[PDB]
PDB file of C-alpha atoms (C1' of nucleotides) in Angstrom:
ATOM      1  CA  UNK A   1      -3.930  37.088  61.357  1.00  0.00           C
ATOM      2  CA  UNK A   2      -5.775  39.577  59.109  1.00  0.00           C
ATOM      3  CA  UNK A   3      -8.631  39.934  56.895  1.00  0.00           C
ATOM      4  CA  UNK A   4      -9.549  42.534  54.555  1.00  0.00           C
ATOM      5  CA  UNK A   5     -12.834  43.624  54.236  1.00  0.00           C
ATOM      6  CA  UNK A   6     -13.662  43.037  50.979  1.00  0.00           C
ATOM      7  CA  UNK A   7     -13.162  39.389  51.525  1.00  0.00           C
ATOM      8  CA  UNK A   8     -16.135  38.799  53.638  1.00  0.00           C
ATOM      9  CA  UNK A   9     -18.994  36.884  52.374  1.00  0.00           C
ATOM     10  CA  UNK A  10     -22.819  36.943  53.536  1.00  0.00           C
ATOM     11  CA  UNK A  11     -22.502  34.663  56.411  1.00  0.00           C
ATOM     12  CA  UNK A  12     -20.356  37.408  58.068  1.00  0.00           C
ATOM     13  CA  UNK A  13     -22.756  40.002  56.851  1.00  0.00           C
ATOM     14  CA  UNK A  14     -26.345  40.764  59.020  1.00  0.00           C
ATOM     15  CA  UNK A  15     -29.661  40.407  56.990  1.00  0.00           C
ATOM     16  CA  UNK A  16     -30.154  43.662  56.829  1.00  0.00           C
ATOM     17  CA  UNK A  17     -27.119  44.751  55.499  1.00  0.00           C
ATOM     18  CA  UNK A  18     -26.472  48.911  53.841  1.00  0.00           C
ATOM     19  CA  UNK A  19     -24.842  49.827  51.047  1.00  0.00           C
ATOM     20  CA  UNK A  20     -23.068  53.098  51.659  1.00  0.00           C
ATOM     21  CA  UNK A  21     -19.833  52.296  50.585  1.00  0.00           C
ATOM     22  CA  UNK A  22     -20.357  49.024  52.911  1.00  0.00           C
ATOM     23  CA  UNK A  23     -17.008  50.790  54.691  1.00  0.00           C
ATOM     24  CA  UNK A  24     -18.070  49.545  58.327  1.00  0.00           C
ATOM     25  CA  UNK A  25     -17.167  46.321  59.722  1.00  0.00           C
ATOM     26  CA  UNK A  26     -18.405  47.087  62.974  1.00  0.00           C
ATOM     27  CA  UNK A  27     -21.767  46.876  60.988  1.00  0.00           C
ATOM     28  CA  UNK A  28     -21.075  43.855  59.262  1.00  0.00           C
ATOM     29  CA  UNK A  29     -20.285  41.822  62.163  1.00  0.00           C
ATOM     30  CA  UNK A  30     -19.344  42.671  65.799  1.00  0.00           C
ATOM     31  CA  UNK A  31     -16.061  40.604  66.795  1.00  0.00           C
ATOM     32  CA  UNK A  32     -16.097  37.112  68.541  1.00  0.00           C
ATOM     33  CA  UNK A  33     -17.872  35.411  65.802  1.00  0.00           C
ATOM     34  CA  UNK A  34     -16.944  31.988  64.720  1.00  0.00           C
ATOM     35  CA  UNK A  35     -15.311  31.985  61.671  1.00  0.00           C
ATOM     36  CA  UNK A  36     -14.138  30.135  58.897  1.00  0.00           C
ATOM     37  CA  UNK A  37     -11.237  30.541  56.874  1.00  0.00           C
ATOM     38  CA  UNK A  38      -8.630  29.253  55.123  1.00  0.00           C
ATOM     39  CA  UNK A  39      -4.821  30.016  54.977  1.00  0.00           C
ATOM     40  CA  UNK A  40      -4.115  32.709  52.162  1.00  0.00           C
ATOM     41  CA  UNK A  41      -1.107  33.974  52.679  1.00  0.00           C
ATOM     42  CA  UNK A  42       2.323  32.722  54.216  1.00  0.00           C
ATOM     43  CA  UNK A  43       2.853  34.837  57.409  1.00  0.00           C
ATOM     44  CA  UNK A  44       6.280  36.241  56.111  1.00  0.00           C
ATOM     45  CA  UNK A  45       6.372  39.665  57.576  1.00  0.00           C
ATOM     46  CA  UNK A  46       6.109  41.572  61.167  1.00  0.00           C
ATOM     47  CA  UNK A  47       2.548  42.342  59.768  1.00  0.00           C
ATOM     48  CA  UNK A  48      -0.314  40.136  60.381  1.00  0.00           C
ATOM     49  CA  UNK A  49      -0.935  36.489  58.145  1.00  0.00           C
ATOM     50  CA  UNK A  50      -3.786  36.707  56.111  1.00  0.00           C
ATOM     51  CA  UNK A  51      -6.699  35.277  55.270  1.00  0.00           C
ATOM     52  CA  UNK A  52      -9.743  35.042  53.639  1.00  0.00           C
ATOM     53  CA  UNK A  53     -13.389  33.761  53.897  1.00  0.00           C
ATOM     54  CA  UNK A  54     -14.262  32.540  50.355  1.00  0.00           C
ATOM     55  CA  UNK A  55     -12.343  28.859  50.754  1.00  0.00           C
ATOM     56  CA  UNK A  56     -10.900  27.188  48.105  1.00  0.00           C
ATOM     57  CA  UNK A  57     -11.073  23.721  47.116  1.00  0.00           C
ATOM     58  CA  UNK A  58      -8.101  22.185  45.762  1.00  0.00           C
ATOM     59  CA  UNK A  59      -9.333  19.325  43.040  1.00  0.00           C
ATOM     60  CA  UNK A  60      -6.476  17.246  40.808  1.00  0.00           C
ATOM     61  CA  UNK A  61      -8.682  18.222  37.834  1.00  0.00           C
ATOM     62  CA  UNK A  62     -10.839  21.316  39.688  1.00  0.00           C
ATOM     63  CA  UNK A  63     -11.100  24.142  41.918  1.00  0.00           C
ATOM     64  CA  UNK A  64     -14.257  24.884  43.773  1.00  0.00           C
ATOM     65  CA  UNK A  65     -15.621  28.566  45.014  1.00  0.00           C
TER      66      UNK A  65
ATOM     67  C1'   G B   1      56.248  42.728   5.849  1.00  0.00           C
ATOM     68  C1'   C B   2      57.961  38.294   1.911  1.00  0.00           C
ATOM     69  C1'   U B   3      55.972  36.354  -2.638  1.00  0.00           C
ATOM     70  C1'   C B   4      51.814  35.535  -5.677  1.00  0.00           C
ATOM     71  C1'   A B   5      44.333  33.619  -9.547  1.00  0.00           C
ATOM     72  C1'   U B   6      42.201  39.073  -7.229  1.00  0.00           C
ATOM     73  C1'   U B   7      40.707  44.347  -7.171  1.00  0.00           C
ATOM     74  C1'   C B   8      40.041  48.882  -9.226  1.00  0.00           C
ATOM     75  C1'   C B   9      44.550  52.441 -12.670  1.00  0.00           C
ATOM     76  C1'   A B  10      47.591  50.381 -17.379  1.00  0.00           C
ATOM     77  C1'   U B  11      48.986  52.986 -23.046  1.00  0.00           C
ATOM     78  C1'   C B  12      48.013  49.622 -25.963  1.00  0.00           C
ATOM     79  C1'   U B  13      46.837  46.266 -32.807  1.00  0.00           C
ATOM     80  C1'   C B  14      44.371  42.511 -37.807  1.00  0.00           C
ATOM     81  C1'   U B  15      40.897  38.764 -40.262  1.00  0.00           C
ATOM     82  C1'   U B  16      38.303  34.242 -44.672  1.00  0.00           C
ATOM     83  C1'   A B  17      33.919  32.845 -47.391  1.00  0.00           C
ATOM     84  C1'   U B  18      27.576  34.426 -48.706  1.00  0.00           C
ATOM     85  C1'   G B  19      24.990  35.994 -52.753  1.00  0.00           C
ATOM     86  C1'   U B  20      23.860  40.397 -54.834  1.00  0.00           C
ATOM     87  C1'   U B  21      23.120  45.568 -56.961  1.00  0.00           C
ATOM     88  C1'   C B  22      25.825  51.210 -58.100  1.00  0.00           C
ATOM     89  C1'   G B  23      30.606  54.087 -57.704  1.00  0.00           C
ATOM     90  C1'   C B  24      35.006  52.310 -60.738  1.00  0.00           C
ATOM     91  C1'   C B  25      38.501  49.829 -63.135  1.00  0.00           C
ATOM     92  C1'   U B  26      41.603  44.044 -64.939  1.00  0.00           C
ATOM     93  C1'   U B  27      40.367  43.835 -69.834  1.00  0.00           C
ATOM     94  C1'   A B  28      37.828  38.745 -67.600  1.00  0.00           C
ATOM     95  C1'   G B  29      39.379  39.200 -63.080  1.00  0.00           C
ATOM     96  C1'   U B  30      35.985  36.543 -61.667  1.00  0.00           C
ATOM     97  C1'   G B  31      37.324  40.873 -60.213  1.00  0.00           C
ATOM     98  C1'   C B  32      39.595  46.606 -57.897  1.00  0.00           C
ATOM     99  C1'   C B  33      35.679  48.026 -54.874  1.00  0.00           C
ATOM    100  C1'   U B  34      30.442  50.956 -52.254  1.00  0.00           C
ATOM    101  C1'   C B  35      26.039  48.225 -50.197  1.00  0.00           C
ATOM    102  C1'   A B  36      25.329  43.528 -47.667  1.00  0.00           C
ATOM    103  C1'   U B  37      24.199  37.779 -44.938  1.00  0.00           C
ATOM    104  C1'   A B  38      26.458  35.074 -41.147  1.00  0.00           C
ATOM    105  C1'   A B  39      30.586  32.652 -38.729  1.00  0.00           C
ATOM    106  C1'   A B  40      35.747  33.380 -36.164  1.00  0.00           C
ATOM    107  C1'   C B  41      42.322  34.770 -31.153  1.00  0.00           C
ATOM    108  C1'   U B  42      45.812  38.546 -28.086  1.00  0.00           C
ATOM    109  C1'   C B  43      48.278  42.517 -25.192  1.00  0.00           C
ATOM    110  C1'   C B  44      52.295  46.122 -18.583  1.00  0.00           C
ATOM    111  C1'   G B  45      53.534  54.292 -16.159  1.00  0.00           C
ATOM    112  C1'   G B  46      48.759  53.668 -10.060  1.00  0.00           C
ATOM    113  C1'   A B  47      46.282  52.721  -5.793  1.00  0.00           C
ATOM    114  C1'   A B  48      43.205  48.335  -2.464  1.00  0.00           C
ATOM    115  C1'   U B  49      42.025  42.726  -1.428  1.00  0.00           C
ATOM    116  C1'   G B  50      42.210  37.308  -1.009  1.00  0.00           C
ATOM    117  C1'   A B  51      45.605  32.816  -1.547  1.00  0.00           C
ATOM    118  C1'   C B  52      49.346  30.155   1.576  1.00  0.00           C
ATOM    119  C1'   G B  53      52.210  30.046   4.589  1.00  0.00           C
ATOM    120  C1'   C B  54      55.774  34.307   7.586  1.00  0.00           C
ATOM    121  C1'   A B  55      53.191  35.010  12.731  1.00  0.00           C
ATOM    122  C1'   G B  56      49.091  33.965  16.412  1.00  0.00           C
ATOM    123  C1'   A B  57      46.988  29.227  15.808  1.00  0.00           C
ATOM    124  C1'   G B  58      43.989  27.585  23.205  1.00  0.00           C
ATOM    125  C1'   G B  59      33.222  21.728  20.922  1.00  0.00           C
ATOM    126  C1'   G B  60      30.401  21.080  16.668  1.00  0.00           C
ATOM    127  C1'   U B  61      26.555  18.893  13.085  1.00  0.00           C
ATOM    128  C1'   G B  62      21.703  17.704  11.338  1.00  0.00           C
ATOM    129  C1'   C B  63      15.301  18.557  13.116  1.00  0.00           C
ATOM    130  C1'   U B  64      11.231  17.921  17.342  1.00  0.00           C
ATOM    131  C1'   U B  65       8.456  21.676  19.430  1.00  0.00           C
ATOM    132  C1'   A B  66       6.661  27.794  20.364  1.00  0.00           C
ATOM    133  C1'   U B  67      -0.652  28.050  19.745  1.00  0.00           C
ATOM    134  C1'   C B  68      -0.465  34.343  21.749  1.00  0.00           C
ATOM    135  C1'   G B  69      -2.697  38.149  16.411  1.00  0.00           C
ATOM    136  C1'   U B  70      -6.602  41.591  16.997  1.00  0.00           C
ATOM    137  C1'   C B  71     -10.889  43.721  19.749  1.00  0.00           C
ATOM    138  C1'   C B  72     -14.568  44.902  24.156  1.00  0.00           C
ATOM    139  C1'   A B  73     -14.725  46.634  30.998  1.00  0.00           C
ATOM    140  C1'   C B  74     -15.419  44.772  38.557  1.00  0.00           C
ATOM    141  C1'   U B  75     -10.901  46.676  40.649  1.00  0.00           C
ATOM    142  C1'   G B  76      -8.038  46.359  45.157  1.00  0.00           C
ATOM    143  C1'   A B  77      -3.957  47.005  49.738  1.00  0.00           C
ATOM    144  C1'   C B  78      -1.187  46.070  57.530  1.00  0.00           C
ATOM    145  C1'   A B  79       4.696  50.555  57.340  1.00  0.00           C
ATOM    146  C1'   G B  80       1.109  68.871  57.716  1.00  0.00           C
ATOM    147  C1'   U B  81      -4.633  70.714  57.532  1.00  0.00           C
ATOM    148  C1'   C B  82      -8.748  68.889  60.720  1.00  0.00           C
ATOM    149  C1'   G B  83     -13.616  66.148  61.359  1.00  0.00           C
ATOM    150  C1'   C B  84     -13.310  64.206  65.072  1.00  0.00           C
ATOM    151  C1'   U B  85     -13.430  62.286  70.410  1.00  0.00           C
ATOM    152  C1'   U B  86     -13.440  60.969  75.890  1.00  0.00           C
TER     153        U B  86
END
RNA sequence: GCUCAUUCCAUCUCUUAUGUUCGCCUUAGUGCCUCAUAAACUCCGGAAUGACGCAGAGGGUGCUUAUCGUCCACUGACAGUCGCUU
């Protein structure tokens, strides 16, 4: 799969987290973690499926961040 | 093309009664005739077009939706130089 940085949330992040262009993903969380995640996009290429950590809820009148 | 309401070219002509005043005559004559109140028809020396048919001639009609004009700012992407390492 993938995941781009941007679309981590706090869980993922440590406390004490930096802001110096937040660039390092080594510093937000070392690998191995469990995760959760929903499907985001349709694996169509050679390149990795992706996927992100804010879910979405799919409502017949409402969707939920 | 044929033949024709057409188009833009055709050279092409006249009238009765209204009351009146001044220029003039008939000698009454209701006038010849200036002013002057309204009513009343036509007619061929070019060059285009539409009107049928010559000749081609093998979907429509009515009414129910369209909300999108201005304006204000988070912002994204797996595919040589060197600043690098172990």
């Amino acid at each position: 799969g993938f995941l781009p940085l941007k679309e981590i949330a706090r869980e993922y992040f440590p406390a004490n987290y930096s802001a110096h262009g937040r660039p390092n993903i080594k510093d937000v969380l070392r690998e191995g973690q469990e995760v959760i995640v929903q499907i985001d996009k349709e694996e169509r290429g050679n390149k990795g499926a992706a996927l992100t950590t804010f879910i979405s809820l799919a409502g017949s009148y409402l969707v939920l961040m």
